[PDB]
Write a protein that binds this ligand. Structure first.
Ligand SMILES: [Cl-]
Ligand SMILES: [Cl-]
Ligand SMILES: [Cl-]
Ligand SMILES: [Cl-]
Ligand SMILES: [Cl-]
Lengths: 204, 204
């Protein structure tokens, strides 16, 4: 990825921060794909997460090529979801979502999945040809038992709004999260170590 | 505890980061009790950390009291230690020492213990009277097998010098930490979740 044009198809600042801290230089182009994929159409939660990441990266890759006839070398897509009791939780639409989300997560152990799509692009015969490599990472997170008072003070904090499941593991969410089991950067929004292992296999 | 005077008996920036982000208003008064306790005098590594956290907070309490003869209401002390194969790792003494702790932790799993002492004070009868609550938190951490040029470049960073085991969690772009099993903020240096639950048992 040394001399290649890397595009990250997500406006999530925590994702950019993770990849910026790792040394990766990239362009930020948020995707216009809106995640209305039928969740019931997938066998596993991480299947829905990986396919969503694929579609977000492909929409960005095609929009860019259609705009100025240049194929970006790599487009990276990602989608972070939360599963508790088999149900899929994404980012809240408001607070009545965020509160009921944290209401469901209170006192249980849930799974965080991030599906990642690495899209290699090239242009051939006036068409954008794409090679997609998908992977996911799972991290188990355990919430403490949360009173409806602290549930509400955290709902209100503005924190839950653009986080999967309506919470983070830094800042105010540390009063909610009791333990983390697995890759913690996966919970923030990006599985960095798995992402690195996927690069060396795609090249060596 | 919403109208009291709170003091953090530690100079670690991450420790004040975690509690400031939680909404706690407090003063930072570094303790001048040095972590010189006899390890062989304890049965467990967490007993050592808790007592070390205890004396460090008790030193600040006495120092604040002898200066003003009015007690700070609550003094918080903490001591983070790392154990790998039974050996206790604390803050390193120079760059080659931190280099050594990283290469022993490289590629394998270790334990992170943070003992915390909450010292309730009162100065009503013209004397410092204390009542201390001790607890600890354990998190298992696994490191990647990272290259050596990278570990010494992390050592010449100055980053390992103020941290137990010679590492922060953002070490090497977030690539050093492979996985986490237990409280996440415990690895950063303060078990915030356990700390808030310890406050509710002290008051209600
Ligand atoms: Cl499903
Ligand atoms: Cl896991
Ligand atoms: Cl709690
Ligand atoms: Cl002991
Ligand atoms: Cl011991």
């Amino acid at each position: 990825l040394l001399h290649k044009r890397v595009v990250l198809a997500s406006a999530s600042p925590r994702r950019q921060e993770i990849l910026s801290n790792a040394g990766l230089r990239f362009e930020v182009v948020p995707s216009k794909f809106k995640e209305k994929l039928d969740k019931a159409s997938f066998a596993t939660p991480y299947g829905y997460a990986m396919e969503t990441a694929k579609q977000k990266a492909l929409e960005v890759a095609n929009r860019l090529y259609q705009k100025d006839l240049r194929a970006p070398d790599v487009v990276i897509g990602a989608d972070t979801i939360v599963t508790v009791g088999g149900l899929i939780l994404e980012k809240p639409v408001d607070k009545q979502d965020a509160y009921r989300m944290l209401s469901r997560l209170s006192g249980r152990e849930h799974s965080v999945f991030t599906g990642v799509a690495i899209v290699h692009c090239s242009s051939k015969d006036h068409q954008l040809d794409t090679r997609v490599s998908e992977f996911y990472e799972e991290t188990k997170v355990k919430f403490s038992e949360l009173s409806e008072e602290l549930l509400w003070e955290y709902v209100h904090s503005g924190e839950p709004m653009d986080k999967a499941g309506g919470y983070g593991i830094q800042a105010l969410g540390g009063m909610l999260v009791e333990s983390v089991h697995g890759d913690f950067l996966n919970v923030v929004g990006f599985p960095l170590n798995h992402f690195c292992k996927q690069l060396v296999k795609l090249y060596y």
